Design an enzyme around this catalytic site. Structure first.
Site, PDB file in Angstrom:
ATOM      1  N   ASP A   1       0.848  -1.192   0.000  1.00 43.44           N
ATOM      2  CA  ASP A   1       0.000   0.000   0.000  1.00 43.44           C
ATOM      3  C   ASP A   1       0.885   1.244   0.000  1.00 43.44           C
ATOM      4  O   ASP A   1       1.367   1.660   1.060  1.00 43.44           O
ATOM      5  CB  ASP A   1      -0.895  -0.009   1.229  1.00 43.44           C
ATOM      6  CG  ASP A   1      -1.800   1.193   1.298  1.00 43.44           C
ATOM      7  OD1 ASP A   1      -1.911   1.908   0.283  1.00 43.44           O
ATOM      8  OD2 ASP A   1      -2.422   1.397   2.368  1.00 43.44           O
TER       9      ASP A   1
ATOM     10  N   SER B   1      -0.458  15.569 -12.081  1.00 40.02           N
ATOM     11  CA  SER B   1      -0.677  15.204 -13.470  1.00 40.02           C
ATOM     12  C   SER B   1      -0.917  16.460 -14.297  1.00 40.02           C
ATOM     13  O   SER B   1      -1.445  17.462 -13.808  1.00 40.02           O
ATOM     14  CB  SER B   1      -1.883  14.263 -13.559  1.00 40.02           C
ATOM     15  OG  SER B   1      -2.279  14.004 -14.889  1.00 40.02           O
TER      16      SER B   1
END
Length: 330
Positions: free
Chosen positions: A35, A199
């Site tokens: 994770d 992004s």
């Protein structure tokens, strides 16, 4: 040193991925959910409330000659899905894919919430976010990667998740045969303890690319792709009959649909998520309403590049002094 381990989807939807981890002496092998959105290595154990164990493999520290109670240490964690677990702490030897750390904090669960009990395939979590998020008190503990870093050939790990197929976690090296083209690296902020990056935009299907900054986290422990409501609406508007369902808890679409791809930007590069990766199947057995793999982050507080996005790429988690993320197509 290096390590290399195969990671396997837990079910036919890729709801999560499990990776075998050796703990203790002799080794006890548990299948952990790696994770990159949390920083605790915790396991079902001989200390877990018996009624909260249903099929998981447990770690028994009393059977490990290298286990030592970390006296006074406790832990307690809550995840973004509302699940939680807590307990006490041992140090022990932990190996992943041939890479061994001695003295790793292994957090033994005394209590786990219902969603953990109900998932017999996940024996615990191995956190790979920054150690500043580790919950052990009163002495915060380091992640497996942080403990291994100095010994690694290069201070990196990579995630290469499969679509409906196994993939690989590598530690200490970049497998140049595992991706196509070049790796594009992008800056990371560690201010929230995550692999947080920006992004450069998105496209839906064959549509034009929209240049826009989307801050979010690379999170292998989250199944879906969670993005701003504007972006998610633009995606689902291209699917006839798709709608946001408050009763189901997100966007659903007709199972008869063919989904468009979704592209996200990494610098000037582009990662394409095929439409099939966005199909999470019937909302309930036999339903013709299917659950979408791109969902709004509006209720979370952060955008999350979960498995839906990451499995479309070869992803480098660069833990150099200034961390960065790398993405390549594959």
């Amino acid at each position: 040193s290096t390590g290399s381990a195969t990671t396997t989807p837990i079910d036919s939807l890729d709801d999560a991925y499990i990776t075998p981890v050796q703990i203790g002496t002799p080794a006890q092998t548990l299948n952990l959910d790696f994770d990159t959105g949390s920083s605790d290595l915790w396991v079902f154990s001989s200390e877990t409330t018996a009624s909260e164990v249903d099929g998981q493999t447990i770690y028994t520290p009393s059977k490990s000659t290298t286990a030592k109670l970390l006296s006074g240490a406790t832990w307690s964690i809550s995840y973004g899905d509302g699940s939680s677990s807590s307990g006490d702490v041992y140090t022990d030897t932990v190996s992943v894919g041939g890479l061994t750390v001695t003295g790793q904090a292994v957090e033994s669960a005394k209590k786990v919430s219902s969603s953990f009990t109900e998932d017999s395939t996940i024996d615990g979590l191995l956190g790979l976010a920054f150690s500043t998020l580790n919950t052990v008190s009163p002495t915060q503990q380091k992640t497996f990667f942080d403990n291994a870093k100095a010994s690694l050939d290069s201070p990196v790990f990579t995630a290469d998740l499969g679509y409906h197929a196994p993939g690989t976690y590598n530690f200490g090296f970049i497998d140049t045969t595992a991706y196509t083209g070049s790796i594009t690296y992008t800056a990371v902020s560690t201010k929230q303890g995550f692999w947080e990056w920006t992004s450069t935009g998105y496209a839906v299907g064959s549509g034009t690319f929209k240049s826009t900054s989307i801050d979010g986290i690379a999170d292998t422990g989250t199944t879906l792709l969670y993005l701003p409501a504007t972006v998610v609406s633009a995606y689902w508007a291209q699917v006839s009959g798709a709608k946001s369902s408050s009763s189901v808890g997100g966007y659903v679409f007709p199972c008869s649909a063919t989904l468009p791809s979704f592209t996200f930007g990494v610098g000037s590069a582009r990662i394409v998520i095929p439409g099939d990766y966005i199909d999470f199947g019937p909302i309930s057995t036999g339903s013709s309403s299917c659950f979408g793999g791109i969902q709004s982050s509006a209720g979370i507080g952060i955008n999350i590049f979960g498995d839906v996005a990451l499995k479309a790429a070869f992803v480098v988690f660069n833990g150099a002094t200034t961390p960065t993320l790398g993405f390549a197509s594959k």
